[PDB]
């Protein structure tokens with residue numbers, strides 16, 4: 001079994017000070033099991049909990065900082 005694994009692209013992550021802030025901020029959600037962001041890929045390997053959280057929420061958070069995102073893994 002496994003949680004809602006959703007390695008979406010996250011952009012605007014201009015430095016480590018973005019990356020760890022995004023990480024730490026997202027990890028505030030109980031509706032996640034993991035987040036592993038990287039500005040190399042421009043991504044967020046979140047595992048988002050699908051009872052509490054939808055991708056929209058993570059996006060809202062990302063936006064509510066100063067960042068943007070897109071699910072590369074559509075299909």
Ligand SMILES: [Cu+]
Pocket residue numbers: 013014015016017018019
């Ligand atoms: Cu930054």
